[PDB]
Design a binder for this molecule. Structure first.
Ligand SMILES: Cc1cc2nc3c(=O)[nH]c(=O)nc-3n(C[C@H](O)[C@H](O)[C@H](O)COP(=O)(O)O)c2cc1C
Ligand code: SF4
Ligand code: SF4
Ligand code: SF4
Ligand code: FES
Ligand code: FES
Lengths: 41, 263, 212, 428, 87
């Protein structure tokens, strides 16, 4: 076609799109490493 | 073995790996100027005064943090290093306030002596200076923070030796400010050592505030009797009086730090 | 601006703040976004979430975030004061921002700023008494090509004129949040005078593929 | 092999840089994405770095550094630590819109680039740091990552390949200095956006104290198609030492400011005449150009007519190529006002941990505002030059250099204007 | 942080009574060795001088700071507690 704009989805994004997406994505991701330590304190 | 041949103005010196240019020069007798490196605290290249040229590298390197390499000659009295120091002091003394006869670190200021040895002799800063809001910590430390130089040698002490994490940097640029974002007492058994750590009189001790000046003083080396640590101490006297208490250096006890009772 | 806190009745540690239950699930997702240790990496997103749940950052929020992360509050204060998108004083329902760097001052963004000041009856960095609009002049925003632009709560209105910001304010003053993007015949970074970089279609998979 | 500055759509590497076809998987999968990436990964890491080094790809960020030589710094095996691929999208420099317009309208290219670059290196996952004002762009990118995870291209078996990967999305909070190699890392780690000294280089101890290789958006977005089509194909574009296609942003004082992909070493006059039709008032009215975003000096129109858009050429021109965001002046402009605005910008965006950019940037802001008003004398211009040369190499990061170079370009080409303003203010 | 007022040996005397003159408050003395301070380049020389002039001495052996392993990269550790949280 190449005759009009087609990234119009972002006219319908609220304040909580990014973080809802990350909340969805947390299931897909792997278990992360560890430093053998809960924090550098 | 694990040694490295290094040169300091031609003079060879053998040093371990993981060292720095600054340690290698201290091994010869040459100490590089400083406003951020202490040798007990963490390293952070914030003042850019430890800038020496290498004999064929195109630029300068911060000697407080750069580890040394095999086959390096370190030019401490070259023209690039001297120009670097002159520029750094131009910057540091640009927004600095003319409070030398008020500032209790009068004959005790590394900014003064470094401007006097390694620096220029004139200001080409024809503009207005800044000013910073002062904080009310407590009855010991007296923050006059328009004359601070943002070296972080106090927040490093708070985090790494006292275990406090109540001191930081708010903002960015000239408008950046060191201290607490809220009115808080930096009150600990090791708080009076920030007075010595700070090269500048941005924070001084309130008891000693305005009472004396360092050339007046006679320094007699003594010890503490408050606790059973035995911390080596200086007792500075002015006309048969006792003006202030200072720590001595000793690596087995009192690693440059004394408590607040004993000062 | 100030970079120091003095306890106001509004902004004080006893000012009420807490995260909703969904915000806590977003927080644990964010912390799973960073390793088992080094969970202090979530300071920026969690603090943006606090700014988002209440519009701005009282000191109570800046301490509750430290509590949630088990971090000292001074680090959160350092972060919030460093980065400019964190509003430590309250602002309006629509936070207007205008680029004034050379790629957008050189196209007279100040005309937009003038016509935007007289429409609201405010100086640059002031608020309105209805608490519906604020205004600041800021630096670059990454759409320098469509140079005269503004930013209203996470969306850009680009290559605009005084008429095409008066229109926008009249729409914002009615409950109609309008469509972002270039307010001209364009819609993107394209050149206005017809296609010049590509008019043919794009090639498909395997085109120019290397042997392997 | 001469006067080569214009190319065709067969070679367009960002085919959907105008949002005309689609940006999701169904529509980026038709433009040649995720075609044989399984085979590319199963080929090996050394082969990808070979493609990189043969392509002659220099860094498409500010500093143009040959990749392959860069990404090979952590080809070395694991010291019981993870590895990471951080992508730089804090598109904070003036004039720059290329990362914005790839982020939206072509995210799957970037995702494939992350994955291929990680397998070229080793990487448990990636962390795409993006600007904070880029909210909707980041949302489009997160939808793209969602689609790729659901499709089976990232995660436990990424395109088969027995290679597990994740692509995270960090989101900044409005700083320009966080686009540095290490300030990006510190802000990811959750501290002030303050650079690091370098050494230690990020390839040995970086994010979370683990190795990293920072990389611009387009530098990674062009990698998988380089592996799929070859470096020699990519090296054919550009000279022997300045190679590749390049995204070009053109800003200010021209009839059609746009973002365009074009062949490297193109002449700038061709760049502005063909694309972004000629400057306001035509070539009669040009005053000066800033080819880099803002951390590069000016051109006085004497050496833009017959000068190429390259690293080496602009270096010979006492200038430099950065993000290749061209800015143009038209003789209707107080140029000192423009450079003073740029220095105000650098003052606002300075971090403040190293003294030269903390003090001298405000020195120069005050001095250039004074020159704008004209309340100085000509003996201060050489002083300003000296302040610049002090700030240049005695900083940690390259922001001091970026705030010094424009002042140098102005004094080097527009000193009679400063003199005129000074004598005007003096006589009045 | 300067260490050039070190590097030389010295020889002080025991301090003695200092009192206030009743007129003005000036610190008075009856001993003339109050401000006696000498400078030697070695310890042997000072021991020799004190033995030569019949004075009894008490020595403080030299105190050098330990060489320390400084590293800037230890501030950004993965496992250790040297991971500083500020900059
Ligand atoms: C103040 C400052 C800002 C920078 N901003 C960016 C930026 O916004 N985007 C970018 O890609 N690089 C930026 N850089 C350069 C990065 O170091 C570079 O992108 C990164 O190291 C990747 O290098 P590469 O181009 O070889 O891939 C900036 C550097 C400085 C000193
Ligand atoms: S710190 Fe005090 S003594 Fe030193 S230069 Fe500043 S005002 Fe003068
Ligand atoms: S208060 Fe003193 S120690 Fe702290 S940053 Fe300022 S000059 Fe350095
Ligand atoms: S040059 Fe500026 S931005 Fe870079 S480290 Fe120094 S103060 Fe920070
Ligand atoms: S002593 Fe090295 S930068 Fe301060
Ligand atoms: S300079 Fe205005 S948006 Fe970039």
């Amino acid at each position: 076609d190449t005759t009009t704009y087609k990234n119009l989805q972002h006219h319908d994004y609220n304040t909580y799109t990014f973080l809802d997406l990350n909340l969805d994505l947390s299931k897909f991701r792997l278990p992360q490493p560890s430093s053998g330590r809960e924090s550098p304190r | 073995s694990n040694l490295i041949e290094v040169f300091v103005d031609g003079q060879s010196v053998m040093v371990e790996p993981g060292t720095t240019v600054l340690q290698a020069c201290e091994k010869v007798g040459m100490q590089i100027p400083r406003f951020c490196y202490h040798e007990r605290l963490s390293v952070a290249g914030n003042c850019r005064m430890c800038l020496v040229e290498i004999e064929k590298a195109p630029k300068v390197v911060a000697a407080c943090a750069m580890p040394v390499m095999k086959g390096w000659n370190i030019l401490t009295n070259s023209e690039k290093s001297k120009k670097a120091r002159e520029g750094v002091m131009e910057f540091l003394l640009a927004n600095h306030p003319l409070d030398c006869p008020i500032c209790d670190q009068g004959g005790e200021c590394d900014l003064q002596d470094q401007s006097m040895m390694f620096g220029s002799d004139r200001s080409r800063f024809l503009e207005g200076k800044r000013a910073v809001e002062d904080k009310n910590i407590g009855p010991l430390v007296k923050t006059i923070m328009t004359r601070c130089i943002q070296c972080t040698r106090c927040i490093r002490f708070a985090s790494e030796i006292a275990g406090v994490d109540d001191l930081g940097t708010t903002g960015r640029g000239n408008d950046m400010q060191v201290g607490t974002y809220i009115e808080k007492m930096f009150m600990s058994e090791l708080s009076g050592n920030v007075i010595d750590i700070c090269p500048v009189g941005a924070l001084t001790s309130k008891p000693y505030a305005f009472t004396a000046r360092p050339w007046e003083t006679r320094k007699t080396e003594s010890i503490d009797v408050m606790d059973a640590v035995g911390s080596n101490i200086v007792v500075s006297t002015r006309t048969g009086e006792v003006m202030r208490i200072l720590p001595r250096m000793h690596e087995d006890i009192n690693e440059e730090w004394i408590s607040d009772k004993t000062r | 601006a100030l970079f120091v806190h003095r306890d106001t009745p509004e902004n004080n540690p006893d000012t009420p703040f807490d995260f909703t239950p969904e915000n806590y699930k977003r927080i644990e997702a964010i912390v799973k976004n960073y390793p088992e240790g080094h969970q202090a990496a979530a300071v920026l997103p969690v603090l943006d979430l606090a700014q988002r749940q209440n519009g701005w950052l009282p000191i109570s929020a800046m301490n509750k975030v430290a509590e949630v992360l088990q971090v000292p509050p001074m680090r959160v204060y350092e972060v919030a004061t460093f980065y400019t998108m964190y509003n430590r004083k309250p602002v309006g329902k629509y936070h207007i921002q205008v680029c004034t760097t050379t790629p957008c001052m050189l196209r007279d963004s100040d005309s937009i700023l003038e016509t935007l000041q007289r429409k609201l009856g405010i100086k640059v960095g002031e608020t309105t008494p209805d608490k519906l609009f604020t205004l600041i002049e800021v630096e670059c925003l990454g759409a320098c090509v469509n140079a005269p632009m503004v930013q209203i709560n996470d969306n850009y209105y680009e290559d605009l004129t005084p008429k095409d910001i008066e229109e926008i304010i009249d729409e914002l003053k009615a409950g109609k949040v309008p469509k972002p993007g270039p307010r001209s015949g364009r819609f993107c970074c394209e050149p206005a005078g017809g296609l010049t970089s590509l008019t043919e279609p794009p090639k498909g998979p395997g085109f120019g593929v290397q042997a392997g | 092999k001469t006067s080569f500055g214009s190319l065709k759509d067969e070679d367009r590497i960002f085919t959907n840089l105008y949002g005309r076809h689609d940006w999701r998987l169904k529509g980026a999968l038709r433009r040649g994405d995720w075609y044989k990436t399984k085979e590319i990964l199963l080929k090996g890491p050394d082969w990808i770095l070979g493609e990189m080094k043969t392509s002659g790809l220099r860094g498409r960020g500010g500093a143009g550094f040959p990749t392959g030589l860069k990404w090979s710094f952590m080809n070395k095996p694991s010291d019981g630590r993870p590895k990471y691929l951080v992508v730089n999208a804090d598109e904070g420099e003036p004039g720059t819109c290329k990362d914005r317009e790839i982020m939206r309208h072509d995210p799957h290219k970037l995702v494939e680039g992350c994955l291929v670059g990680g397998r070229a290196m080793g990487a448990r996952a990636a962390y795409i740091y993006i600007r904070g004002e880029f909210y909707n762009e980041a949302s489009n990118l997160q939808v793209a990552i969602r689609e790729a995870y659901e499709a089976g291209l990232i995660g436990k078996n990424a395109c088969g390949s027995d290679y597990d990967f994740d692509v995270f999305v960090v989101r900044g909070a409005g700083a320009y200095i966080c686009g540095e190699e290490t300030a990006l890392i510190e802000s990811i780690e959750g501290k002030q956006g303050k650079p690091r000294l370098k050494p230690p280089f990020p390839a040995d101890v970086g994010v979370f104290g683990c190795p990293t290789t920072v990389a611009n958006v387009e530098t990674v977005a062009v990698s998988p198609t380089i592996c799929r089509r070859g470096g020699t194909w990519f090296a054919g574009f550009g000279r022997e030492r300045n190679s590749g296609t390049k995204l070009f942003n053109i800003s200010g004082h021209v009839n059609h400011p746009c973002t365009v992909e074009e062949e490297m070493s193109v002449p700038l006059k061709e760049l502005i005449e063909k694309h972004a039709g000629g400057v306001t008032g035509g070539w009669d009215n040009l005053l000066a150009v800033i080819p880099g975003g803002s951390s590069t000096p000016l051109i006085p129109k004497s050496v833009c007519e017959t000068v190429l858009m390259d690293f080496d050429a602009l270096v010979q021109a006492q200038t430099g190529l950065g993000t290749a965001a061209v800015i143009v002046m038209d003789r209707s402009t107080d140029i000192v006002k423009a450079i003073a605005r740029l220095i105000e910008f650098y003052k606002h965006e300075s971090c403040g941990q190293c003294t030269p950019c903390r003090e001298g940037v405000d020195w120069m802001n005050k001095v250039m505002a004074r020159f704008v008003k004209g309340d100085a004398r000509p003996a201060e211009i050489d002083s300003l030059w000296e302040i610049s040369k002090q700030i240049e190499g005695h900083t940690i990061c390259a922001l001091g250099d970026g705030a010094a170079w424009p002042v140098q370009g102005l004094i080097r080409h527009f000193r009679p204007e400063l003199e005129d303003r000074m004598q005007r203010f003096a006589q009045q | 942080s300067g260490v050039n007022n070190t590097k030389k040996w010295k020889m002080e005397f025991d301090t003695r009574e200092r009192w206030e003159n009743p007129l003005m408050g000036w610190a008075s003395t009856a001993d003339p060795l109050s401000n006696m301070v000498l400078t030697f380049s070695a310890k042997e020389d000072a021991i020799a001088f004190a033995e030569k002039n019949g004075w009894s001495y008490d020595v403080e052996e030299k105190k050098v700071p330990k060489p320390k392993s400084k590293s800037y990269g230890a501030n950004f550790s993965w496992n250790k507690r040297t991971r500083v949280s500020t900059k």
